[PDB]
Structures are given as structure tokens and as C-alpha cells.
Amino acid sequence: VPTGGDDPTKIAMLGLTFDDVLLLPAASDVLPANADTSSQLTKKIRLKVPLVSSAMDTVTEARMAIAMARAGGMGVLHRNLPVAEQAAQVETVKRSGGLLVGAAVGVGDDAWERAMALRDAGVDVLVVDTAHAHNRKVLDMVHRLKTTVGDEIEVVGGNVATRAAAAALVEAGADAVKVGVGPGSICTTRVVAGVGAPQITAILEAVAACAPHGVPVIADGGLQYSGDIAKALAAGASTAMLGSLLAGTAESPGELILVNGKQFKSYRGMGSLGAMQLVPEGIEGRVPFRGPLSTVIHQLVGGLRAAMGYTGSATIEELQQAQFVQITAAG
Amino acid sequence: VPTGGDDPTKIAMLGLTFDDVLLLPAASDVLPANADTSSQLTKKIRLKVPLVSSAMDTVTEARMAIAMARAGGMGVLHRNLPVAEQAAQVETVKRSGGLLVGAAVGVGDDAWERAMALRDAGVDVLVVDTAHAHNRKVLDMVHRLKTTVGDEIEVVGGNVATRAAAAALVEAGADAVKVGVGPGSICTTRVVAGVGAPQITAILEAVAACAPHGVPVIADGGLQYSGDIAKALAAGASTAMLGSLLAGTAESPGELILVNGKQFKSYRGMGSLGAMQLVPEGIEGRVPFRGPLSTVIHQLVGGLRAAMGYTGSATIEELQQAQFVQITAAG
Amino acid sequence: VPTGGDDPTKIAMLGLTFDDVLLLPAASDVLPANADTSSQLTKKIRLKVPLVSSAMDTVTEARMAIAMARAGGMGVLHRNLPVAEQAAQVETVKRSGGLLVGAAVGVGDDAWERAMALRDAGVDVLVVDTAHAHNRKVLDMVHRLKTTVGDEIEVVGGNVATRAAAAALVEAGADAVKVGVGPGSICTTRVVAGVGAPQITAILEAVAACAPHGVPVIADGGLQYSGDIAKALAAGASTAMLGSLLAGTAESPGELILVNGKQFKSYRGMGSLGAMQLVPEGIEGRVPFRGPLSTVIHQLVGGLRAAMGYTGSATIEELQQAQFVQITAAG
Amino acid sequence: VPTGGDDPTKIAMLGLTFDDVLLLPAASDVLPANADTSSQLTKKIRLKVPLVSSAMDTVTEARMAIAMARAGGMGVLHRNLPVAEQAAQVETVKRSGGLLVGAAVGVGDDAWERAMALRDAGVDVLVVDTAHAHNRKVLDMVHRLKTTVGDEIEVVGGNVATRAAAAALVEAGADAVKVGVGPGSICTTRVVAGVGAPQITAILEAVAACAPHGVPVIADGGLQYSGDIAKALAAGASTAMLGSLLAGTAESPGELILVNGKQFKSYRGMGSLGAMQLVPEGIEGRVPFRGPLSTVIHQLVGGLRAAMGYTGSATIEELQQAQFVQITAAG
């Protein structure tokens, strides 16, 4: 074995991230303005725009959820607050029309009660929200939710970064599988634990387990540009979950901050000290202020549409079949 | 598959750019001063210097076209202006002697009328000027131009980045194929759409489709140094189209700009907000002022001549057979 | 041979360092708080935490050794001081309870006498401390120590970076093998001699020789983050030896230094001019002040525990079987 | 072909430079102080230290040549001056004892007369000094010199970067082959012409042609650290030629320069505008002042000795058999 030892499986794969690849143009009859951007969030739920906002307390509360749903995507309400308050935010969203909304739950002692209160509040999607879903406790929560409230509510499980973990969530009954262990912009899991999986490879692997069962994959974390959204979908994901790209918007929680004459908003990991209040796996940072959500989404979907034009993809289903070229450091 | 999934074709190639390769020296009887730098722009047109200026409104109007032709290359007049004005610029060039000149046309509703007005004005080369030529509308424009005015005018089609797209333009009747999707210095297609193809690989692939039909390939975009010109031709291109390298010259449109005691000129993508006036695929930037075009071309051709010396290439046709070494990040 | 010449063995391997790999998550029933972090330092000695402090005069004297042992690891006392003083530091550590302690010896003329004085002082571990242990003089010292005092004292040999060198130390009778030629943060061997071996590959190779003989491998040098500790153990090492990561602590020798309003401590290679007082193979630098050792170790072990959680490793022995993904420059 | 096209030979090799590799430690009985650093400069001339100074007018005139020879290496006098003056510098060196000295000649009209005047002056080594020796004019000069004065004078030919070019110089009668097209610190051939060959691969290839004929290879250009000297010799070179590493010394031509409170000396390519006084293939730069040559050489040889210690190489001939590990960008 060229990299050392006598075990070829010790280093199991070469992991690619978004920056490692570009989409290849292909024969096209598709105009960007006419591409169909709709896609499955879950087995049963189709969104008009394949984007969801991260379940983070500097990204998604009721205001962001309402704006995301109106833009044709969805928000996932964070769970770093009391149950009654999270459920009240679900009600606030439903009050603003027939708007789709999701909400995160953990697998702790109070997670079941949280889930039931969200259900009562009329939530459409429950996201079992962990750093590592390949675990009996997480798989049991997914299964029990699906068997109990699964007729009225779609259940998302995550996060995973391997084929076997995605397969386990599929077996548990997940309606969608969320992919991303370590790629987040505010993530320090890669330096603190030395654990992760570059996101293009993680998506390709999870899709290999999920697509043959008709389970959509949500690409979560590491998306820096609108082009990354196109790459993630081309890798086989059905939607993308955004934190950093949406934390700078007016609709996100938190105040404008002014440093050196420029405007910013705070953006922090749910595993940062500030969020948990210990061995943190996230930092507390800042992102440039970007203005209204509607305008950010327009530009993000605009980029996706351009990609669909270049690749001849009339639908997201066709984009999931596009090809990549791998690029070097120079590129 | 080591990079993920079960499909070996998902990541179809490893794409190299100019910085990924160097030309290998070979046995040489060629002195730089005596190398023959002439090359086919199209099937019928041979230039004394294998260089053309980009169809951009911060690079080529009549002044640049005249200077390029006198230097032994050619200018392609941009189309970001009314038809009558573009045609008037063609006439201005023809007024300055028997000078070759090209002009860009789109595939929009007014493109045909633009093309006919350019023809009337005495243009030598029409460039069907798009970001993605692998499209029925573009191929039809190429074909119809070639069948209508193809006896008196050479028709260039572009841009492409794959073998199949180059093949389609050849079948459509292109007299030359222009290569470059995403590599331009002012291009943001790679970050906005996540689409592109590193330029050495794009040239190698397009040449594989074009050379066996005797159709010359124009390498368009991403050339940063005179050495890149030699690499592009060695990859099989017959000419190179330059934007950034010529936007700093006296002959380009626009004014000198002074910032921090240094001189610059504005250089902007035709897909930038400022050019289109939306989801832009180019930026508005600046390049150092470089002085007279004649002098820039001298240095660029000087570098090419040196390369022909090192590789023993007496002609561009011989340079197209030179070999590369791939280098690493360290190199 | 693609990289040149006709000898495939000239470039014998592709060497990976910590930054080249990530740990892959796997099926897990392990909570970080419940993972067992104990591991063999030597054939006979098991530590509660798999960490030892470097034998450097800006890292480990009696104070650091006491604190390391109390934290469940061990200190190795440097040998850049007279024999009587090093032995007095061993006695100082033993005075503070039944605390494990190690001490470095060279292979010079006075090394044997140093070793015997340390033995008299009650040292638990002798570390034959060289830059290159694949040498008859070093192997003889290891063997003679093991045959003379080997019943009461464990003998560590190092450093090595190849399978054959590790094999030689095993044959000589080493109770543990220390791995690292060139990777230290303060090391200039790679630029001065052009010699080294990236540390993940060096560990994989040394482990291939040491594990089948039940000899533990100590990963020494190049660890920058707590995540690197997890990677090193996953590569097959049984413990990690830390210099830079512990030189910033209160317990390390030396004074606080203030530059530009920030606090630092001096950290220098034992091959630096200042340490030797010539062709130095280390620099004299500074590291940020990090506070109490206890707190640094808590965070380092915290990261390791997280990794054990992600990988489903209940023990270090299980972590040594985890898998990697190789990442690119982009990742 | 993964990188494009249908020709596997288009991209003929993967070129490695010094930074791409490290020397692997091996079994050693060699102490650095006792290693034998002598090596063949040419078939007949053995130096005590395997180092020669570049034929550049900011590196080697009589003072540097005298100092190099006294240090056990050799200087090659530049040829950017009238014949009588170069010959007078040869005489000045011979006046300072039985000191070896070389001198550069071109292949121009006056090169033969230059060569004869150097011969009369008592030069030991003539270096046919070009950027590309794979050329009939250069090979003829080498041959004619060798047949005319070859009994009393050793003839070096260069530069080359390929096996075939090295083979041609061997056939022409070269007593040594100098390797390096494009790697020099002050070189812009790689950006101006797009031509070059990373130096480890160039050495491996040239050695494959030269060693079986007993012709020593001189590694010329790109050496930045003393460790690079060890790498070059391990790749199979018999000596290294240094420009930048010696241009900062007291013995080099030119004055001390003070900028921002630090001392520098000018260092310029022989293909720079200033040297030629056009399309330059070198820049005019500055290097830190390093003090006396004797001290620089001590440190450089010190590093080489350390490498010989780590690799168990008692002689340079043994070092030429050492092995490498290839490293990544991270390493």
C-alpha cells in the first residue's frame, strides 16, 4: 500500500469537497428562466425551490421560516429554546397562511415531549437533529416517530456521511436523509475530533444508499456559493440546507453589528460555547449582512438556474444525472 | 469508485489548467527569431500572429481591431451596442487598409439582422458569441449563416468545453471552434453556476473533435502570461483569444484610472451587472495599464517564439505536437 | 516510471500527514463521556490518558511531570542538564506520590551513567532519545538497558520513521517504539537535511512492524490539534507525545513573555542553537500561553473522546481499527 | 485519457520538484562528521565538496572562484564581459595557488576564441553555457572542444531537462551534463515561454542517460535550502550548482544594499534586461546578505552531512542510492 501499512482498506476513499469539482456543460435545450427548480424535501413533500434553512439560533426562527416558505423553500426551527416557545413559533408560522414548516428535535429525555408538542402545533416536518445519526438511540427515535405520527408528519434523520449510515436511517423509516458530518463553515469537528467526510463524496455515498429506496438526500453544510448548490444536487442530493449563506439576511435572528465600517451579523455553531451556554465543536463568528432573504434566494436560485441551463437539466431530477470534472489545486 | 458512489463516469475526467502543465524542451534547430508564428484562425483565414482580441466592450472596438490587424492578428468587435454602430466600426476598420476584422453576434431576435448589417459592412469573420454553444438555437445560427453568407464570410462558433459540443459545431458547419466555458479572468460562472472545464483539458478534448475535420480551435479565456499562449497552442489550439492581457493597453476602450499612485484601466465581463446594464456571471475589475498594443504583442509573441525555440517547433503546426509535463502544487 | 527514471522503488511511497486524512464516522453505541481512554505506553505500563510530554527543556521538568502523571498521562524529563539534576527531578516526582515518570538518555559516553543514576532515583521509563534510532549504537543501548535493568524499568527506543527501523528496535528489545523523524513543529530537519517522513504514513509503517510483536507505538511530533491525537491513535499508535501543545502551559519551564499585548512562552527545539549552547535542526520560537496543564489536557482528551464517539470506539484498541478518508488540498 | 484527448503520451510525465519529496532515513553506521562529501564534478575531476557556483555576474568572479576552490568546491566564471577580462580572472585565480577554476562560454561567433583564451589562461573546466543544449550548434561546440583541448580541459555541456537531451550531450563527448531548464529562483522561462521541467524528475531522467556512461550530472537551479542539495544528489546528481544561495555572500560581486533596515545584495538572471544590457527570461532581484562564503558553505555542507547520517550514506556514491517519499501539499 503506497500510503503505508499493509491494509488497503485503512484509507477507504479519496474524499472530494465542492471546490474539488465543476459541473460539465452538456447538450442543452433548457433556458435558465424555464428550468423547473422543484424537488423532494422528503418522500411526500415537494418544494418549489430546493432550499431549506438550518436549524440554528442565528439562522431560523419564525420570521426566517415564514420567509423561506414564501420563497418556495422551508425553514427548520432550531431547538435551542424551551418546548413551549418552539411550538409557539410553529403556530406563528401556520398563522401566516398555509406555509410548510419544519422543526428540530434531539434524542434526549425531553425530545419525545418536544416532538409531540410540535405535532400538536401543526408542524409538517420533524428533523431528528444530531451530529451522528448512525446510533441506536437516533435510529429508534426516527422509527418511533415514523410509526407514531408518520401518517401526518414527515420525519427527517441526520446527519450522516457514509453509505452504511444512510442505509441504517432508510431502514429505520426516514423520509429523508440529511448529509454532513464536519463540513459546516462554523464547524471545528474536523480539528477537535479529527472526524469528517468531504461533502461531494459523502453525498455520492449517501445517495447510493438512499436513491434506490426513493429516499431524498438533504445536503447540509459547507455550501459557500450558489454554485455549490448546483454541485450538491448534481451529486445526487434533492435539497440543500443552508446556514452561513442565510445567516447574513434580515430575517435571521440577531442584530446588525458594525465593525470597521462594514455591517455583519453574528453566526454561531450550535456546538459553540455560546450556544451550549465543555468541549465545543463550533465557533462563534460573523457573516456579512446580505439584506432581505427574498433577494438572497433570488440570487441563489438564479445560479442554480444557470447551472441547469449549462447542463441541459430541465428538472432537478435531470440535474442529479449531470457529470463532473475533478480539478486540481491550480484550477 | 474511490471518490464515491458506484458510477465511474460520474466524475468523468481530471481537468488540467494552464498552471498544471509545462512544455517539455525537445531537440531543436529552431531559433526564436526564425520560427514561423502564422496559424489558421479559421479554415480559410491564416494570421501572421496567432492572437485575436476578445469581443468585450473594455477590450475591442475599432481602434483595437485596427491595431490587432496591423500587428498581424485580428480583433473581434463586441456587440454591446446598436447594430448601426457596430457596422460603422467595421467600416472604420476597412477604411484603414485591407485589414481583417471580426465581429460578434448573438442568437437573439435581432442577431440575424446584426449579422447581415455586418456583412454589408464588409466583415471577414462572424463570431456566434455565446456562453454555451451546445444548443440547437446556436447550432442553427451557425448553420444558417454558413449556408447564407458562408462563401464570403468565415463563421466561428463558441464557446464549448467538451468533445461532443465541439463535434456538434463542426457538424453545424463552423469554420472555427472557440473553447472556454468558465476560465476567464473576470468570470464567475464557476462560483455562480458551479460550471466549468479547466482549459488545457477543454482544449485537448475540443481538438480531438475538431482537428480530424480540419477545423481550427480558438483558445478563449484564462490566458495570464505569454507562456499560456504557447501551452494553449501546444494543447492543439490554432489561435488564442485574449481579454485581460489586452485590456490594459492604450488601444482598448476606456480611460486611464489612477489608484494608489498606479495606473489601471477598467476591465469587465460582458456578463457583469455594468455590462448588462439579474444574475451576473462576471465581475467589473481593473487591470494594470500596459502601454501600446504593439509593445504588448511584441512581448507576447516573443514568449511564444522562445517556446518554439525550446520545443524545436519551426511552425505552429509543429508546436501543436509538443509534449507536456504535469506539475504539482509545489512546482 | 511517471515521475522519472526507470526505478519504481526510487520514490518508495506517498507519505501522508495528519492534515491529509480525516477519521470516518462509523456505527456507534459509544458516548464520549463513557469511552475508555486508557492505553499502553509500553508493553507493561498502561496510562489512563494516552498522552506523554516531550523530553524538551521548554516542556518537561519535574512540575510538568507531576502534573502529567496526575492528569493520567506521563512526563519524560529532558536530559539537557547534569545527571545529578535530572536524577533529582526524578526524586522530586516520586516524592509527590506514586507517580509514573520517564526520563531521556542519549547514547553518548555518559549516557550509561545517566541511565544508572535515573534507575537509582526510581524512574519507571527510560527513553533512549535520538533523532535516528536505526543505528547499531542506539540498538545496543536499548538492548543493554533491557538486559540489565529491564525487569524493573521499561525501555523506550526512538525515533524511527520506517518499518525496518521499527523492526530493528523490536528485535533489540524495545518495550515501546517512538515514531517521528522530521515532523516536529520546531523541526528544521526537513529543510536542513531534506530528510523526513510524513507522520500518518510513518505510524502506519511502524505499526506494521510493532503491533505483531505486541510493542506499542508512540506518535511523537507534528500534533497540532486534539484531532491529530485521534488520527495518530487510529493510525495504530498507542500514545501521543506532545511538545508544542503543552509548551504553552503554566507547568512548562520558562517565563511568560509579552509581545504586542499577547502572552507567549518560549518553545525551542533540542537541536536549536540555544539548546545546544554547529548545524541546528530546530528553531527557537514561541507558543501562545494556554494556562493550566489540567485544562489543556481536558480539552485534548475531550476531542479524543468525541472522536471515539463518532467512530464507535469504546476503547483505544477499537480506535486503532478505525478508517480514514484522504482529503485534497481544497478540503 | 483522464486528463483529456486520446493520446497518453501528450502529457508524458508527472514532474516532481525538490519540495515534492523527502529523503527516507535508512540503517546507518555513518556519523555526519565522518561522511565523505567528495564527488565527481566531471569524469576526471573530483571535488572535496560537491558544490559549484553559478556562472552569473552577481555570483561568480575571481573572488568567489578563489573562495569556492579553497572551500573544496569550484567557481564557474561568468561570460558577461570581454574575453580578455574573463581570461584575466582565470589567471587571477591560478595566481592564488593550485586552485581549480571553470569558466563559461557560449556558442556564438566569438565563443571559440573565448574558449581558446581561457585555455591559454589555464582554465580547468569549460562550461558550454546555454538554456537548451539539445541543439546541433551546442552539441558541435562540445564535441569540437573535446576533440581539440579535451586532453587538458574537461568540458561541461548544458542545460538539459530530458533523458534524450542528456544522451545527446553524452554522445557529443560531454565530461559532465548540467541539468536545469526553468527551475532557477530568478527564472521566468516558465511564465514567459511556458517551458520547464521540475528538477527532481529532470535529474532522475538525465541520470538515466548519464550514469550508464559514467558521466556525472550537475544539478543546476532551484536549490533553496541545504536539504535540496541532499535531495539533488540522492536523485542521482554528482554535484549541485548554486546561484541564489551564494549571491548573498561577501565574495559575490556587487554592493551591499540597505532597504527597510535590512541588508541585501542584488541578484539577477543572465537573461534579465539589466544583464542583457528584448524578451527577458529572468528578473533582477535581491537576496539577503549572508556573510562570508566560508560560513555559508559550512552550513550547506553541514546539512548534507546530516542527510548522509540519516540515510546511512558513507559517500556521495551511496547517497545517490537513497530513497524518497513523495509528500502532499499538506506536508
Ligand SMILES: O=C(Cc1ccc(F)cc1)N1CCN(S(=O)(=O)c2cccc3cnccc23)CC1
Ligand atoms: O453531543 C455532541 C458530542 C458528540 C456527539 C456524538 C458523537 F458521535 C461525538 C461527539 N455534540 C457535538 C457535535 N454537535 S454540533 O453542534 O457541533 C453539530 C450539529 C449539527 C450537525 C453537525 C455535523 N457535524 C459536526 C457537528 C454537528 C452536536 C453535539
Ligand SMILES: O=C(Cc1ccc(F)cc1)N1CCN(S(=O)(=O)c2cccc3cnccc23)CC1
Ligand atoms: O445568458 C446567459 C445565462 C446562461 C446562458 C446559457 C446557459 F447555458 C446558462 C446560463 N449568460 C450568462 C453567461 N454569459 S457571459 O457573459 O458571462 C460569457 C460570455 C462569453 C463566454 C463565456 C464563457 N463562460 C462563461 C460565461 C461566458 C453570457 C450570458
Ligand SMILES: O=C(Cc1ccc(F)cc1)N1CCN(S(=O)(=O)c2cccc3cnccc23)CC1
Ligand atoms: O546529532 C544530531 C545530528 C544527526 C544525528 C543523526 C543523524 F542520523 C543525522 C544527523 N542531531 C540532530 C537532530 N537532533 S534533534 O534535536 O533535532 C531531534 C531530537 C528528537 C527527535 C528528532 C526527530 N527528527 C529530527 C530531529 C530530532 C538530535 C541531534
Ligand SMILES: O=C(Cc1ccc(F)cc1)N1CCN(S(=O)(=O)c2cccc3cnccc23)CC1
Ligand atoms: O537565447 C535565449 C533565448 C532562447 C534560447 C534557446 C531557446 F531554445 C529558446 C529561447 N536565451 C534565453 C534563456 N537564457 S537564460 O539567461 O535565461 C538561462 C541561462 C542559463 C540557464 C537557463 C535555464 N533555463 C532557462 C533559462 C536559462 C539564455 C538566453
Ligand SMILES: O=c1[nH]cnc2c1ncn2[C@@H]1O[C@H](COP(=O)(O)O)[C@@H](O)[C@H]1O
Ligand atoms: O457547532 C457546530 N459544529 C459543527 N456543525 C454545526 C454546528 N452548528 C450547526 N452545524 C451544522 O452546519 C450546518 C450549516 O453549515 P454552513 O451552511 O456551512 O454554515 C448546519 O446545518 C449544521 O448541520
Ligand SMILES: O=c1[nH]cnc2c1ncn2[C@@H]1O[C@H](COP(=O)(O)O)[C@@H](O)[C@H]1O
Ligand atoms: O462576464 C463574463 N463571464 C464569463 N466569461 C466572460 C465574460 N465576459 C467575457 N468572457 C469570456 O472571457 C474571455 C476573456 O478571458 P480572459 O482573457 O482570461 O480575461 C473572453 O474572451 C470571454 O470568452
Ligand SMILES: O=c1[nH]cnc2c1ncn2[C@@H]1O[C@H](COP(=O)(O)O)[C@@H](O)[C@H]1O
Ligand atoms: O530541535 C529539534 N529538531 C527536530 N525535532 C525535535 C527537536 N526538538 C525536539 N524534537 C522532536 O519534536 C517533538 C515535539 O514536536 P511538536 O509536538 O510538534 O512540537 C519532540 O517530542 C521531538 O521528537
Ligand SMILES: O=c1[nH]cnc2c1ncn2[C@@H]1O[C@H](COP(=O)(O)O)[C@@H](O)[C@H]1O
Ligand atoms: O535569467 C535567467 N533565466 C533563467 N535561468 C537563469 C538565468 N540566469 C541564470 N540562470 C540559471 O539559474 C541557475 C541559478 O538558479 P538558482 O540557484 O535557483 O538561483 C543558474 O545556474 C542558471 O542555470
